[PDB]
Amino acid sequence: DEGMWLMQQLGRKYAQMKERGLKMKEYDLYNPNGTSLKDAVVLFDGGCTGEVVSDRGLVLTNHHCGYDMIQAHSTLEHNYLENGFWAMREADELPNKDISVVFIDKIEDVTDYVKKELKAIKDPNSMDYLSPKYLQKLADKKAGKNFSAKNPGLSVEIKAFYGGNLYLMFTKKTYTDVRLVGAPPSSIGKFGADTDNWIWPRHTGDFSIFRIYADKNGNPAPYSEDNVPLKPKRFFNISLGGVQENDYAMIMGFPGTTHRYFTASEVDEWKSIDNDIRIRMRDIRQGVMLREMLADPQIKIMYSAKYAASQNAYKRAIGANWAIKTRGLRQNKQAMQDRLIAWGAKQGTPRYEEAVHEIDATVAKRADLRRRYWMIEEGIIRGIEFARSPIPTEDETKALQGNDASARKEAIDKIRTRYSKFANKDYSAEVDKKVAVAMLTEYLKEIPYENLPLHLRLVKDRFAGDVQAYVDDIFARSVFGSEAQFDAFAAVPSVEKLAEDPMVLFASSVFDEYRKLYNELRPYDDPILRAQRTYIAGLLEMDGDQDQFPDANLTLRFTYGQVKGYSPRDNVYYGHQTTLDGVMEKEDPDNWEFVVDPKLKAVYERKDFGRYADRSGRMPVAFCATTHTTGGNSGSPVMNANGELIGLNFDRNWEGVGGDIQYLADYQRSIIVDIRYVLLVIDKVGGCQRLLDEMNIVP
Numbered sequence: 001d002e003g004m005w006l007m008q009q010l011g012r013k014y015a016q017m018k019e020r021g022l023k024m025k026e027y028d029l030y031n032p033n034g035t036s037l038k039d040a041v042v043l044f045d046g047g048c049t050g051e052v053v054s055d056r057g058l059v060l061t062n063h064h065c066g067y068d069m070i071q072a073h074s075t076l077e078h079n080y081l082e083n084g085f086w087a088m089r090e091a092d093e094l095p096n097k098d099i100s101v102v103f104i105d106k107i108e109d110v111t112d113y114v115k116k117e118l119k120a121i122k123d124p125n126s127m128d129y130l131s132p133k134y135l136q137k138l139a140d141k142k143a144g145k146n147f148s149a150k151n152p153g154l155s156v157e158i159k160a161f162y163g164g165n166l167y168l169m170f171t172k173k174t175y176t177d178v179r180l181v182g183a184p185p186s187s188i189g190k191f192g193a194d195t196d197n198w199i200w201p202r203h204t205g206d207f208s209i210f211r212i213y214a215d216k217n218g219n220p221a222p223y224s225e226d227n228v229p230l231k232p233k234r235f236f237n238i239s240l241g242g243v244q245e246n247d248y249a250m251i252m253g254f255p256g257t258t259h260r261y262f263t264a265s266e267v268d269e270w271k272s273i274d275n276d277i278r279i280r281m282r283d284i285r286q287g288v289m290l291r292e293m294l295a296d297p298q299i300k301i302m303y304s305a306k307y308a309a310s311q312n313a314y315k316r317a318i319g320a321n322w323a324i325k326t327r328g329l330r331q332n333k334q335a336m337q338d339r340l341i342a343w344g345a346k347q348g349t350p351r352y353e354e355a356v357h358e359i360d361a362t363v364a365k366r367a368d369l370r371r372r373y374w375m376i377e378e379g380i381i382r383g384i385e386f387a388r389s390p391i392p393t394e395d396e397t398k399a400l401q402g403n404d405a406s407a408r409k410e411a412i413d414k415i416r417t418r419y420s421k422f423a424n425k426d427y428s429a430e431v432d433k434k435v436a437v438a439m440l441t442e443y444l445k446e447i448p449y450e451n452l453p454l455h456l457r458l459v460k461d462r463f464a465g466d467v468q469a470y471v472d473d474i475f476a477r478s479v480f481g482s483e484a485q486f487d488a489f490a491a492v493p494s495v496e497k498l499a500e501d502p503m504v505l506f507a508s509s510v511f512d513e514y515r516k517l518y519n520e521l522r523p524y525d526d527p528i529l530r531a532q533r534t535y536i537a538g539l540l541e542m543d544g545d546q547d548q549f550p551d552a553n554l555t556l557r558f559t560y561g562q563v564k565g566y567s568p569r570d571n572v573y574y575g576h577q578t579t580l581d582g583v584m585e586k587e588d589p590d591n592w593e594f595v596v597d598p599k600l601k602a603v604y605e606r607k608d609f610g611r612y613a614d615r616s617g618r619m620p621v622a623f624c625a626t627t628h629t630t631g632g633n634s635g636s637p638v639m640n641a642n643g644e645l646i647g648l649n650f651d652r653n654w655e656g657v658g659g660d661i662q663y664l665a666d667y668q669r670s671i672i673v674d675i676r677y678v679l680l681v682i683d684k685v686g687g688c689q690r691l692l693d694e695m696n697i698v699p
């Protein structure tokens with residue numbers, strides 16, 4: 001069901017949740033004045049979500065959430081990324097360098113407090129009502145200078161909601177010694193990771209296991225050999241009852257962003273400019289890189305990660321436009337605003353029609369600059385690798401002028417390090433020249449002479465319109481076109497060589513225009529934001545927050561719905577649950593993506609599923625639900641009707657990507673790893689009995 005609900009809206013949403021099958025009592029999942037299941041949820045390491053699943057502070061989150069730190073502890077002897085990691089005792093649990101978890105300790109509404117403060121700002125057009133500095137200052141004199149010394153490991157944050165119409169203060173509790181407990185091998189954690197990205201049906205065992213460690217009194221403390229496993233306020237029980245079609249599911253976690261209150265015109269701009277240019281430019285770039293990857297196995301190895309990373313937003317943009325073109329997103333937002341316009345007429349307040357008109361006229365006024373901005377970001381800043389090649393810093397310029405030969409060598413030696421990082425083991429100038437030529441050709445076809453970053457004017461003015469020659473010339477003459485050319489420069493360095501270096505000139509000219517456009521464009525956000533406040537104010541006055549959730553803003557939210565499959569197109573039906581069969585069916589030993597761990601293959605051939613199989617003896621893997629999810633929900637606990645853990649969220653299907661603008665009941669699904677599959681992997685792949693005994697597993 002629709003919405004990323006604030007914890008303080010649990011009350012208002014409880015009847016609609018009970019109707020969907022919720023059995024738990026309200027105060028059992030969120031109490032402002034007590035302990036609740038909220039207290040078992042964590043913001044894992046800045047972006048992900050995690051959940052506390054034991055009394056000794058064991059935490060589950062996604063594999064891809066715990067990936068960098070699994071990778072860090074991986075040597076060539078002990079390759080935990082590949083093989084997995086199973087700490088046989090608490091003391092073998094590996095600590096981590098730059099990790100955190102954040103419990104949300106308290107949440108208070110402070111709208112009245114914050115609105116009164118703002119009321120003493122003379123300036124009507126002040127953007128302080130959304131400025132995080134300003135809100136942090138209002139926070140610090142609420143909790144009192146000096147709160148964080150007096151309350152150790154606590155902090156406070158105020159955030160704006162519904163476009164400045166609601167404010168909340170969050171009391172956070174951050175633990176910093178979070179150790180690696182367990183991970184499946186990556187063949188299970190990233191099964192089908194590139195190909196099945198955004199795909200249901202899905203077969204990916206996407207979990208990793210950590211523990212929160214603190215001082216002897218359970219207080220936040222950075223890594224110290226004397227730290228001990230935290231006792232949490234509350235943890236999640238692990239259900240073994242499984243899921244079935246139509247079962248209630250709900251999720252809690254930290255969604256990043258939505259655009260639920262976009263005007264029709266804003267939707268048009270997102271489709272026309274933001275998404276279409278992403279799509280066009282990344283097609284071109286992806287074509288050339290596909291072509292060069294097939295011709296050469298060594299290019300294939302070097303470009304994989306760059307290609308698939310470009311591919312991630314590409315397919316997101318494809319999904320979103322498919323929803324805009326087929327599911328009536330634009331008409332939905334036109335309707336909602338027309339509805340407020342009519343209601344606002346009848347009330348005698350033209351304010352709302354004013355706000356809508358203001359967003360419209362602004363959107364249309366900034367169309368060209370935004371088109372230009374997207375063309376450059378997608379085409380060049382991301383499109384072309386040599387766009388991100390070294391510029392000398394003003395400090396390095398200064399040392400290359402005048403005098404000191406030790407300072408001259410020092411400035412050079414750290415340009416060497418930047419050059420080395422641009423032209424690394426994965427960079428190929430030859431590929432980059434071909435990608436540049438195609439992107440630049442499309443850029444020049446779209447962006448007229450008078451609006452070109454300066455160096456790109458030379459294609460007409462000097463190479464007679466020959467884009468291949470211009471690009472060949474940048475590599476031929478430039479100190480960064482090859483190692484030997486850089487060395488030649490380093491031996492006899494001079495600021496006048498760098499000043500006239502055509503790659504440097506291209507790079508800095510391109511970034512100049514990128515900056516200048518950002519800047520011209522920034523002043524147009526403010527009127528839209530101000531009108532957005534007025535617009536959302538009206539939607540709330542008219543219809544209430546009952547069925548109008550606040551845009552996501554990296555805050556703790558709940559969403560509820562059902563375990564349900566769907567139909568993606570004529571005559572094809574996807575069900576609610578995948579199985580270990582689908583893993584077997586997808587095995588390709590000659591492709592890293594679809595490798596099947598030998599221990600898992602063997603668990604499948606003996607049907608050694610134990611208490612984790614379903615009725616009918618199938619081994620569950622994943623399931624999907626009508627729950628409303630987005631970036632930031634990676635790793636969120638999924639609960640059944642009694643609040644017991646039934647899985648971890650790890651993706652959305654591509655048909656649900658326009659869900660950020662409008663929930664799609666018949667298409668949008670959260671894709672969730674089945675907790676029974678999690679336990680199976682721990683039990684029969686890791687052998688790690690102790691942490692099963694640790695969890696409170698319920699029938």
